[PDB]
Amino acid sequence: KIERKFTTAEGGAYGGVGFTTTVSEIRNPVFRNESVEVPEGWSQVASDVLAQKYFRKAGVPARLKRVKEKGVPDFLWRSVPDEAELAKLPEEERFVGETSARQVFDRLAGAWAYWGWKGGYFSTEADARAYYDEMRHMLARQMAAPNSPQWFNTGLHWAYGIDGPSQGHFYVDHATGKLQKSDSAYEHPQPHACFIQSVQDDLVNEGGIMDLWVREARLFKYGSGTGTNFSSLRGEGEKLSGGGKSSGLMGFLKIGDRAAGAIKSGGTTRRAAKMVICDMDHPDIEQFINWKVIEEQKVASLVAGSKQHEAKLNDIFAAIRSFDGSIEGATDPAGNAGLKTAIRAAKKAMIPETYINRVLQYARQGFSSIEFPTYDTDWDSEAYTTVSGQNSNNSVRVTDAFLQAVKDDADWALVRRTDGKVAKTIKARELWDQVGHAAWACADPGIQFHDTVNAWHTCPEDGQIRGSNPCSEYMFLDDTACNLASMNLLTFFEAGRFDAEGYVHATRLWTVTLEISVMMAQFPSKEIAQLSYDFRTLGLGYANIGGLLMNMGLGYDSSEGRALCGALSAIMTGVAYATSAEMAGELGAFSGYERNAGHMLRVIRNHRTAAHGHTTGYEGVNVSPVALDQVNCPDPRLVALAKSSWDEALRLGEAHGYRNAQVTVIAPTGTIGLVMDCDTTGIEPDFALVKFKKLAGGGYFKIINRSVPAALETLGYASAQISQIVAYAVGHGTLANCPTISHSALVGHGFGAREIEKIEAALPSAFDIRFVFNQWTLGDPTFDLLRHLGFTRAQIEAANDHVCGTMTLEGAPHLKAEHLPVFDCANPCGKKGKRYLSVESHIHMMAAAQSFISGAISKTINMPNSATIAETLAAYELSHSLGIKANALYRDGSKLSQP
């Protein structure tokens, strides 16, 4: 079942990979572990996130002993502290924290193999030995990684003896199939990063509104995210059986929003991840669309008003203080003309008369001034915690019918939830307008295309897909969990070849492990435990496709680059489904499959019809996906492999079905992308060609984007000119080679024992005017303006581009113009660099990938500050053109916290 392609049998643990140890610390202008062992190629920040957030910091026993279990192999036995050996050492060092990456690599794959074995997944013991070896190798060289909950939880009870009580958690016994209540907080890992949760139009019973906040709080405590479609909640003013009428959807959303703000996700600095989705026909949707817009207005008022009070109250207190006579007359606006002026100013600034009256009654008691805190517009201001809507991503579900109504300028009915009658009729175009402006003002609402989501839904018999997770990549039925892992697409690219069969080997074995994590997990709800057991969704993904594309010498907006993406998307998902189909053959499909086979192989078919590049022939899809482009793919192998693995994936599917109702999902990889040293996260392109790497010392050093020399290696450039181009962008750090301001030109003036001072005071490289401190030198200094006299300001900026670098490859020597788009990034590089990738470039590759992905693609498109509301809606409409399931926008410098 499992074979070996990356590891040996003899050095199989870590076949020839080096190790080093670094210090990792964080302190404010607080944490430090002086020995952090990692693979040698690991960056400083990769070692940082590993120690700071993945290492089990306390309670690790210093000496362990295996626990032999009858029927499970030798190397896979659970381990418990050996107090006979710990009793030797002092109690200070009996229990410590993790210190090395292989500790975590071992506990992760050990737990995976241990559970996978007792689940009978591997048919041999050599396969388990191989799977164990192969897994830790892929982790060690940053080839793939599970979502963070796996990193800090799974293997804790298997490798060490760590245990503890647990309440309200459940699992399905893989042997019996019976639902059970978990009694260990660790024996069953909690490996799921997020959950889609349902809510019923009910206040106080299970599955209801108030109980949802308990369910969301349970998730937030351990660090998981949650998402929910709230549209079943009856609108404001809708009749309730008992007598009165409901307060409405917005009122309860504000409860859970305020609850989310108070629970630190995992006890950490981290915010709680929350997704709030409402359907467009909901009666209160107009309140929902403009929720963050209004609250933002309240923030702005909160700070304009608070500072107004502070200023004019100080003026009133000054007028009372500066009064000749008693306090009784000082505080009378009649007798005190100056106080009357200060109140006149206060009233005209809309300071309420009521508060003007109380500062007066303050002063007669004998008070000099009152504490009146004012607020700022910065992120940390209490004003943001005062208003609502700040603790959730808000998105609306739009159906194709609504988008038909805006193009027809038709009417749109908002229908009551209680009786199905029409509460309101509004032009669809003004509703679409509200969405566009709200997303132009603040980030939200995001948008998800209901009909596109459900056209690819594998199990509609058990309900519609109504919601998603906080980053909108996992889309399945309510009360199911996201089970995620992503691969570094760049680790498969040696010389100029993409290790294709090592890639298919990668997805196959990670499809296996993600399956084991469904088997081994406990869950925060009885229904979530039962459902994930019954459907076994997986979310395998990838990152560093922006970095890979650049490394192989292809641009992000190139048509060949998008065809490549759609290829590797098709291959990973195809093999994953085929792998799960093999799992269903040797173990049985998920219990919800038999009633859903008709639909699941329909979407499987549609995937295959797209790998063959067909224009038409799609069964029951609303927007035909963008087919696998055969012609521009920069390798005929991968297209032929995408065709073959999808062909078989259907064949085994007809044979046995599938062990899993979903397989693939593209996450943001916001933090696991850091520990894998991914140059680009998720599906994103790169953002710059000169970066600032943190290194072992703790400082940040300016470096060339490592993909730029590699790109200049895989095209036709020699090593002489690659360092020429690199020197152009990053700079030379010195004036020894600078043409315009040379040393010789410098000593033209009284310079001599002042050059080495300049020459590496120059490598901080902050676009230099470093000619500052020397007094003695043949000189009074006014302010900024002794820019040194003799050279043109063009000579200075030419010298600046020389030492400090242009930070772009535009204007670089020896670079052919046809090879310029290959270095385009999401933002202009350097200061008068002007090239960047289009909004449409982002969208069109999401499309190219979405056609071969079970769920959706995490994405928030950054748009220029100059963007208009029409362009905003155009982006949404353009996404719907190409079978996109969800999208989200943020315009540069939209929000109030932005300086």
Instruction: Name the catalytic one among 442, 471, 482, 829.
Output: 471
Q: Is 240 in the site for ligand DTP (CB under 6 A)?
A: yes
Compute the distance between CA of residue 611 and CA of residue 234 in angstroms, rounded to an integer: 43
Which of these ranges, 171-179, 201-209, 274-282, 527-535, lies near ligand DTP under the rule CB under 6 A? 201-209
**In sequence order, which residues have a C-beta less than 8 Å from that of residue 356 and are 6 or more positions away?**
316, 343, 346, 347
652 is in an annotated binding site: no
* Other beta carbons less than 10 A from residue 265's beta carbon: 19
Strands 274-279 vs 393-398: parallel, antiparallel or unpaired: parallel
Q: How far is the CB of 358 from its own copies (least distance, A)?
A: 7
Q: How far is the CB of 326 from its own copies (least distance, A)?
A: 16
Angle in degrees, CA 148, 154, 159, rounded to 5 = 135
Q: How far is the CB of 58 from ligand DTP (least distance, A)?
A: 14
Residues 265-294 within binding reach of ligand DTP (CB under 6 A): 267
221 is in an annotated binding site: yes
Compute the distance between CA of residue 758 and CA of residue 193 in angstroms, rounded to an integer: 51
Choose which of 9, 67, 210, 240 interacts with Mg ion (CB under 5 A): 240
Q: Which is nearer to ligand DTP, 194 or 825 (CB)?
A: 194
- If you search the block for the tokens 């590089």, which residue do you land on? 829
Compute the distance between CA of residue 848 and CA of residue 689 in angstroms, rounded to an integer: 25
Residues 818-877 within binding reach of its own copies (CB under 8 A): 865, 868-869
Residues 214-233 within binding reach of ligand DTP (CB under 6 A): 221, 233
Q: How far is the CB of 259 from its own copies (least distance, A)?
A: 5
Q: Which two tokens stand for residue 344?
A: 């006149």
Compute the distance between CA of residue 371 and CA of residue 597 in angstroms, rounded to an integer: 68
Q: Which is nearer to ligand DTP, 421 or 793 (CB)?
A: 421
Query: 424 has which bridge partners?
Result: 414
**In sequence order, which residues have a C-beta less than 8 Å from that of residue 677 and are 6 or more positions away?**
41, 42, 43, 46, 142, 488
Choose which of 11, 41, 120, 267 interacts with its own copies (CB under 8 A): 267
Could you say which DSSP state residue 284 is in? T
Give me the count of residues in the chain: 899
Tell me the C-alpha to C-alpha distance, in Å, between residue 675 and each of 142, 323, 807: 7, 67, 26
Compute the distance between CA of residue 338 and CA of residue 329 in angstroms, rounded to an integer: 12
Which of these ranges, 79-87, 236-244, 606-614, 681-689, lies near ligand DTP under the rule CB under 6 A? 236-244
Residues 290-319 within binding reach of its own copies (CB under 8 A): 294, 297-298, 300-309, 311
Instruction: Name the catalytic one among 229, 469, 551, 606.
Output: 469
Choose which of 16, 18, 71, 242 interacts with Mg ion (CB under 5 A): 242
Could you say which DSSP state residue 664 is in? B
234 is in an annotated binding site: yes
DSSP per position, 226-262: EEEE-TTSPPTT-B-TTSSB---HHHHHHHHHHHHHH
Q: Is 327 in the site for its own copies (CB under 8 A)?
A: no
408 is in an annotated binding site: no
**Half-sphere CA count of 55, side-chain side, radius 13 A:** 24
SS3 call for 79: strand
Residues 353-412 within binding reach of its own copies (CB under 8 A): 354-355, 357-358, 361, 365, 372-375, 377, 386-388
Q: Which two tokens stand for residue 677?
A: 């040293």
Q: Is 473 a catalytic residue?
A: yes
Which of these ranges, 75-83, 198-206, 352-360, 554-562, lies near ligand DTP under the rule CB under 6 A? 198-206
Strands 690-694 vs 539-543: parallel, antiparallel or unpaired: unpaired
Draw the binding track, 162-201, toward its own copies (x: CB under 8 A; -: no contact): -----xx---------------------------------
241 is in an annotated binding site: yes
Q: Is 57 in the site for its own copies (CB under 8 A)?
A: yes
Compute the distance between CA of residue 724 and CA of residue 809 in angstroms, rounded to an integer: 11
Choose which of 285, 363, 423, 441 interacts with its own copies (CB under 8 A): 441
Taking CB within 5 to 8 Å according to partner kind, which of Mg ion, ligand DTP, its own copies, none is near residue 201? ligand DTP
Q: Is 469 a catalytic residue?
A: yes
SS3 call for 658: coil
Q: Is 52 in the site for its own copies (CB under 8 A)?
A: no
Compute the distance between CA of residue 705 and CA of residue 728 in angstroms, rounded to an integer: 13
Q: Is 349 in the site for ligand DTP (CB under 6 A)?
A: no
Q: How far is the CB of 184 from ligand DTP (least distance, A)?
A: 16
Q: How far is the CB of 108 from its own copies (least distance, A)?
A: 20
Strands 95-96 vs 60-61: parallel, antiparallel or unpaired: antiparallel
Q: Is 264 in the site for ligand DTP (CB under 6 A)?
A: yes
Q: Which two tokens stand for residue 642?
A: 């995408």
Q: Is 761 in the site for ligand DTP (CB under 6 A)?
A: no
Residues 875-894 within binding reach of its own copies (CB under 8 A): 893-894
Q: Is 804 a catalytic residue?
A: no
Q: Which is nearer to ligand DTP, 267 or 864 (CB)?
A: 267
Compute the distance between CA of residue 788 and CA of residue 771 in angstroms, rounded to an integer: 8
Q: How far is the CB of 241 from Mg ion (least distance, A)?
A: 5
Taking CB within 5 to 8 Å according to partner kind, which of Mg ion, its own copies, ligand DTP, none is near residue 271? none
Is the omega angle on the peptide bond into residue 445 within 30 degrees of 0, that is, cis?
yes
DSSP per position, 668-703: --TTHHHHTT-SS-TT-----SEEEEE-TTS-EEEE
201 is in an annotated binding site: yes
Draw the binding track, 194-213, toward its own copies (x: CB under 8 A; -: no contact): ---------xxx----xx-x
Burial of 12 (0-12, 13-18, 19+ CB in 10 A): middle
Q: Which is nearer to ligand DTP, 246 or 569 (CB)?
A: 246
- End-to-end, the C-alpha distance of the chain in Å comes to 57
Taking CB within 5 to 8 Å according to partner kind, which of Mg ion, its own copies, ligand DTP, none is near residue 300? its own copies
Q: Could you list the residues that contact ligand DTP (CB under 6 A)? A: 201-203, 209, 221, 233-234, 240-242, 246-247, 263-264, 267
Annotated binding site: 201, 203, 221, 234, 241, 264
Residue numbers belonging to the annotated binding site for dATP = 201, 203, 221, 234, 241, 264
Interface positions with Mg ion (CB under 5 A): 240-242
Tell me which residues are annotated as active site: 469, 471, 473
